[PDB]
Write a protein that binds this DNA or RNA. Structure first.
Ligand SMILES: [Mg+2]
Ligand SMILES: [Mg+2]
Ligand SMILES: [Mg+2]
Ligand SMILES: [Mg+2]
Ligand SMILES: [Mg+2]
Ligand SMILES: [Mg+2]
Ligand SMILES: [Mg+2]
Ligand SMILES: [Mg+2]
Ligand SMILES: [Mg+2]
Ligand SMILES: [Mg+2]
Ligand SMILES: [Mg+2]
Ligand SMILES: [Mg+2]
Ligand SMILES: [Mg+2]
Ligand SMILES: [Mg+2]
Ligand SMILES: [Mg+2]
Ligand SMILES: [Mg+2]
Ligand SMILES: [Mg+2]
Ligand SMILES: [Mg+2]
Ligand SMILES: [Mg+2]
Ligand SMILES: [Mg+2]
Ligand SMILES: [Mg+2]
Ligand SMILES: [Mg+2]
Ligand SMILES: [Mg+2]
Lengths: 105, 201, 207, 86, 125, 64
RNA sequence: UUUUUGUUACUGCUAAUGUAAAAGAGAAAUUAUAUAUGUACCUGGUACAUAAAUAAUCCUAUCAC
RNA sequence: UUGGAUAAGGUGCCUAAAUAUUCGCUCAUGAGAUCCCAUAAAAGGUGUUGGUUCAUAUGAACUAGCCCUGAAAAUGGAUGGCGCUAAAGCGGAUUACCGAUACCAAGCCAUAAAAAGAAAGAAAAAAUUUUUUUUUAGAAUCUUUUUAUGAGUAGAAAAUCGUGGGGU
RNA sequence: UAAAUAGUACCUGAAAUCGUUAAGAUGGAACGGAUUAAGAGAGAAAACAAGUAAAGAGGGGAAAUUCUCUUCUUUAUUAAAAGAAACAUCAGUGAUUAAUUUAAUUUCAAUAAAGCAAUCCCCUGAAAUUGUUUUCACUUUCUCCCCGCACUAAUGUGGGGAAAACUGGCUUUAUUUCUUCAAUUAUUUUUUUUGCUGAGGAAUUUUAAAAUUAUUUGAAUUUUUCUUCUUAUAAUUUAAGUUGUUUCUAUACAGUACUUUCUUAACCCACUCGUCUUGAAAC
């Protein structure tokens, strides 16, 4: 009816880690219809947006974003590692992100 | 895992494999509602599982049993406690995940009219060779003092009758719609009819 | 100009040097010491009459017709304003997804290709950058909240470059509209906007 | 001297030719002989067979005899041991 | 945590607090090297206070610059700030704490004439 | 540089000097891992530590 | 208990905001697993029909004024 | 510090990565689950799976794999937990993947060593061939540039920070 | 009284300990390290605008009289620089998907025609120190016959006996986009989509050389729109460690934006110091 979508959906999982260590430089993302390693490589250069809400106004608005990039896959099941301009807060680990399609090929 | 809420009927699933697939969905963030918990299967003889429960029943805090392990013998609470033992439930996030699960015996109102799914990687028909032994969670819970096995079946009978009538009406509606469809194909511009024909609609 | 290394044939175009830096131990100099640069080499699906979708700006989701390669990488489009509502506009090919459908394959329109090309020679890269005086005139208005919008819209209307561009837009629209409206389903195709529905997965779609 | 970036000595043509003053000739010869072949497709892959008939049929008898002898000796040892068992 | 503005890079911004200074109030936060067997901070156990080391040092080319990107020189009277007329684009002045208001006014109005900047030209006004 | 290649691939008269002229090579870990350094190349198990005659080229192309 | 506008002199105050998750958050027979379900007849049995990579599907969405 | 790729071990959930593939064995009314390491024997089985001999497609003997009996302690408990039998168990094979402060490439700090220097002159930019900005260096334990390296109790040395008082 | 929060328990008046108000947190200890986020307080010395014109108040230096320099306004004119983000180019270091010249190693497979043998064939097996030489077995068919006459798991079947060369095997052509031309190794040449990094700034080694492009002076050979050999001048970079274009901050003077300090969450981790001791979180 209105407000076209033009992106693919995703959920932000935790950080890149082992058992007992953290490494918060990269974050792991899951994409909605992608569940093989070969299909995940399709998205290997796209731009990622994380949009959330606040309670006060900050520049006249109550919404702000944190931008990132898709860097590589995470092995055999269509998960990806993403690098953001700032580290994602850990109070976000089940929220939504937008896997855009801007840098088109 | 991109839905507001999933509804699963557990009739025919093995307890451990189902409990493992639910915990990761809860951790990633997904509401789950589990129904018909009295029809869950386990992969040993009924006597072999009764002995295991008897071992579970005799461990308790010596000085004060009000504390200590609490033995819950309804079938739905058994699955609840088996899932709880696969989550890090002593942090904050892991306690948030445990609260996004709801369990029922039978199939009460809000969910008797919703769509139910199954998990094929936990179905007994695909996972257990046919000459092995297995038991039913309702019988086992009755053997250790649950006392509501009969009433659930009595209610399931009525639910199934109502569902059968609904299905009859649905089939009639679908046929009536198919006739209206097949008539209207003749009254369209021919090229739209070819483009629908080519793509199998 | 071009240099040929290992049989590659990259194209060279001139470039200017602007930034200045400190010298080591007397007065400064200019940093860059090059004089040419390699051209962009766009991808092999950008034609002169294909339909494409805008992804980012105000007209996101709309469909348009690609018109010219603008000698500076980015390219000019028109989704005929008389049909669609999209003016002459400049976009970066990285913000477009281009389909496989070409306007000039319909034999009802193919006989207009030369005249379409003739109008497009006047489209110029400079005519899209707005002059400093217009910038200053618009920004003087910030010193009610409804008169200002109308004033801003009005000041843009007498930029001579805008008028020159309006002329070409109208010429192309009037030339091309009558043959587009003969194909009903195709005109409705150009009048709608693209969107993503569930049950289409974007790594199995071809378009 | 001040150190600079180190250039890839295998993929950078200028430094590759600087270090190996004979690489340009060899690469040119290889490229020429590569193009000649593809320009003669549907006209190559035919002579190969007509000369394979020339020499492979001569080599075939020798190879067949060699492998036949190896298999025969392996069989002889087997029979000699089996009979020794009794 | 690395902080970088232009060419200036800081390799850390938090202080190195003394071990046990949050639990005992007779222990001050100024850093002292832990000595003595069985410490867990001297032995580099994970999860405790870190120790300073020469590896956090700053670039020689940007070691004493302020965010102004100038070095700081502190003056006490007018005659001390005359060597700044030859190097005014690399230095900035700051007035000492114990000079009177009358002296401060003159120092400020001479710094203005020399085209040198004053870091604290708002005090005692 | 081709002269040193010649003297290394064939033990030419100038081999001690050419070889002693070069710094010891410093290599990455291999791209698909090892099998087991504990065991030998000629053991019936996955292993590494033996003399592998011409299979060294495959390994050193992966850890170049 | 329709709706419009907002939560951008002096005592603690006396106008007042939150979110573990909107972007088509679409989908109600039952039953078996070396087989099932629906219809007619007879007291479960005859007879016929239909499913069987069955969400690898179906349904909904742009035609302004 | 930023990237990359590993070791030892792992890939059902706890917990990052295979409910992976491809062959055999096992049913336990006290199964089993790998260095150190956190116990088990002699002697038996008409449980089931392979194999070796002697006897007109049947008897007998023997052998060794998993399973079972031998097998009893004190607060309630431990393959780490849940649990697991078309294994998530035991013996192999083939691939992918995840994983260090160790390995590789690049920046920066310091230590050690090295190549050199004590006979010095103009560079841009903004301004309509006139002005304006910035720089125009030369301290010897000093100034430029290059490479390798960096664990530490008892103990030893250098450089550096601060306090009362005296001369300049 | 200059001052009484200098009132005689009288200069200044720290910490432990307690009172008042405000703001937060709070399922069987509390505080911490790493990393971010949400609030709150404070801030302009880099975190835009030199200069130009007009008027008003001042302060100096030279030659009570004329020049010339500067600070603060108030108006209205005007550049220029800087920091970020996007895209592109190059270089260094990786991932990812499609190929490729020549050769070696018992390879195969298909289409037209004509033949060879019949328990027979390329093979394989059982017999009478290596190469021959003989003997008998090895093929199944939806064909035929006899017996059981429907006996089967089978839209067929158990036992016995025949026929054929359709199928399988082997020769001679003349063929390879009907079809096949594999696999491993040696030796060579490319290719799709993308992550991270940009040290330095050469008054005479950012030169020389090398590569490229367009005119040339001559010889080869591989005989050619990347064929070789700097055997003559010009330019360029692939040489000689990142450059450009647009937009925003913004026509600002501290605002909810930017810098910074506190407070409080999350995710991972974290036993009480000093001492003697082989060994300390130690009952
Ligand atoms: Mg731990
Ligand atoms: Mg934790
Ligand atoms: Mg412009
Ligand atoms: Mg600091
Ligand atoms: Mg000790
Ligand atoms: Mg391994
Ligand atoms: Mg060892
Ligand atoms: Mg690392
Ligand atoms: Mg294992
Ligand atoms: Mg996991
Ligand atoms: Mg017997
Ligand atoms: Mg495990
Ligand atoms: Mg692995
Ligand atoms: Mg040391
Ligand atoms: Mg004293
Ligand atoms: Mg006094
Ligand atoms: Mg209590
Ligand atoms: Mg015949
Ligand atoms: Mg003693
Ligand atoms: Mg000792
Ligand atoms: Mg002792
Ligand atoms: Mg101790
Ligand atoms: Mg003790």
């Amino acid at each position: 009816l209105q407000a076209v979508r033009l992106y693919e959906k995703g959920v932000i999982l935790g950080y890149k880690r082992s058992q007992r260590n953290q490494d918060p430089n990269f974050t792991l993302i899951s994409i909605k219809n992608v569940n093989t390693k070969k299909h995940a490589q399709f998205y290997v250069g796209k731009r990622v947006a994380y949009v959330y809400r606040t309670t006060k106004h900050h520049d006249g608005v109550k919404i702000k974003c944190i931008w990132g990039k898709v860097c590589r896959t995470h092995g055999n099941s269509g998960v990806i590692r993403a690098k953001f301009k700032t580290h994602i807060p850990p109070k976000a680990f089940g929220d939504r992100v937008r896997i855009l399609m801007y840098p088109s090929n | 895992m991109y839905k507001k809420e999933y509804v699963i009927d557990c009739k025919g699933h093995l307890l451990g494999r189902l409990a493992s697939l639910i915990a990761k969905e809860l951790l990633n963030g997904q509401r789950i509602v589990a129904v018909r918990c009295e029809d869950i299967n386990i992969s040993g003889s009924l006597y072999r599982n009764k002995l295991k429960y008897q071992e579970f029943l005799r461990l308790r805090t010596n000085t004060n049993p009000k504390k200590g392990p609490l033995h819950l013998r309804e079938p739905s609470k058994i699955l609840w406690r088996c899932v709880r033992g696969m989550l890090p439930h002593k942090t904050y996030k892991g306690q948030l995940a445990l609260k996004k699960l709801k369990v029922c015996v039978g199939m009460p109102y809000p969910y008797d009219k919703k769509k139910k799914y199954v998990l094929p990687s936990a179905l007994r028909a695909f996972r257990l060779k046919k000459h092995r032994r297995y038991c039913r969670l309702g019988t086992l819970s009755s053997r250790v003092g649950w006392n509501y096995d009969t009433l659930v079946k009595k209610n399931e009978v009525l639910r199934k009758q109502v569902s059968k009538a609904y299905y009859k009406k649905k089939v009639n509606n679908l046929n009536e719609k198919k006739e209206i469809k097949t008539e209207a194909l003749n009254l369209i511009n021919p090229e739209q009819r070819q483009v629908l024909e080519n793509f199998g609609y | 100009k071009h240099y040929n290394v290992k049989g590659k044939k990259k194209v060279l175009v001139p470039v200017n040097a602007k930034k200045t830096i400190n010298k080591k131990y007397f007065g400064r100099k200019v940093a860059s010491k090059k004089k040419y640069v390699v051209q962009r080499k766009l991808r092999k699906s950008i034609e002169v009459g294909k339909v494409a979708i805008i992804l980012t700006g105000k007209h996101m989701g709309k469909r348009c017709i690609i018109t010219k390669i603008l000698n500076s990488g980015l390219l000019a489009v028109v989704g005929p304003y008389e049909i669609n509502g999209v003016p002459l506009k400049r976009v970066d090919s990285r913000y477009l997804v281009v389909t496989s459908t070409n306007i000039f394959n319909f034999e009802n329109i193919a006989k207009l290709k030369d005249d379409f090309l003739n109008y497009a020679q006047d489209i110029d890269d400079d005519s899209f950058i707005k002059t400093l005086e217009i910038k200053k005139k618009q920004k003087k208005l910030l010193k009610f909240m409804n008169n200002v919008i109308d004033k801003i819209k009005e000041i843009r209307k007498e930029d001579p470059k805008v008028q020159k561009l309006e002329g070409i837009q109208k010429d192309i629209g009037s030339l091309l509209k009558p043959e587009i409206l003969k194909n009903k389903v195709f005109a409705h195709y150009l009048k709608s906007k693209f969107t993503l529905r569930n049950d289409m997965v974007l790594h199995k779609m071809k378009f | 001297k001040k150190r600079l970036q180190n250039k890839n000595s295998l993929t950078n043509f200028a430094v590759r030719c600087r270090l190996n003053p004979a690489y340009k000739l060899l690469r040119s010869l290889a490229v020429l002989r590569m193009r000649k072949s593809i320009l003669e497709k549907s006209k190559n892959k035919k002579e190969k067979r007509v000369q394979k008939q020339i020499q492979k049929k001569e080599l075939q008898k020798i190879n067949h005899d060699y492998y036949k002898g190896v298999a025969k000796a392996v069989k002889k040892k087997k029979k000699r041991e089996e009979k020794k068992a009794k | 945590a690395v902080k970088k503005v232009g060419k200036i890079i800081k390799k850390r911004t938090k202080k190195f607090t003394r071990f046990q200074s949050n639990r005992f109030m007779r222990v001050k936060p100024a850093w002292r090297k832990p000595r003595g067997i069985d410490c867990r901070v001297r032995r580099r156990y994970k999860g405790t206070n870190l120790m300073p080391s020469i590896g956090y040092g700053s670039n020689k080319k940007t070691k004493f610059l302020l965010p102004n990107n100038k070095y700081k020189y502190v003056v006490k009277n007018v005659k001390e700030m005359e060597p700044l007329i030859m190097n005014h684009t690399k230095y900035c002045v700051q007035i000492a704490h114990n000079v009177s208001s009358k002296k401060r006014k003159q120092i400020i109005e001479r710094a203005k004439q020399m085209n040198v900047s004053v870091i604290n030209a708002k005090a005692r006004l | 540089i081709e002269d040193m290649v010649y003297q290394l691939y064939t033990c030419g008269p100038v081999f001690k000097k050419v070889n002693n002229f070069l710094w010891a090579f410093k290599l990455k870990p291999p791209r698909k891992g090892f099998k087991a350094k504990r065991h030998a190349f000629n053991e019936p198990r996955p292993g590494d530590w033996g003399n592998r005659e011409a299979h060294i080229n495959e390994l050193i192309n992966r850890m170049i």
